[PDB]
């Protein structure tokens, strides 16, 4: 582990992007996480909220 610092920079950036991609799966309270279903099985007035 002589090159620990450079490797650490790389891993931090990779981990940041990874968590950013994973957070797409959370629902945040909506009935579903994917936009297509929300826009498919609901009328526009309720789909707004």
């Amino acid at each position: 582990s002589a090159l620990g610092k450079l490797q650490d920079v790389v891993n931090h950036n990779a981990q940041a992007l990874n968590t950013l991609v994973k957070q797409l799966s959370s629902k945040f309270g909506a009935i579903s996480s994917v936009l297509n279903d929300i826009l498919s099985r609901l009328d526009p007035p309720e789909a707004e909220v």
Binding site: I31, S40, R41, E46
Partner: protein, 50 residues
Amino acid sequence: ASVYAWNRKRISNCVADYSVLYNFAPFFAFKCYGVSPTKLNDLCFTNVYA
């Protein structure tokens, strides 16, 4: 049936068409949770109880 002995039924393996319901009555109550009634006629469901 009377409410304390309500009557369940299962519905599967059919082509469900929800466009016959509207011709029944002025429908004093018609509300849907989680789905809209007009966008009902294009979805696929797992198991349907009545």
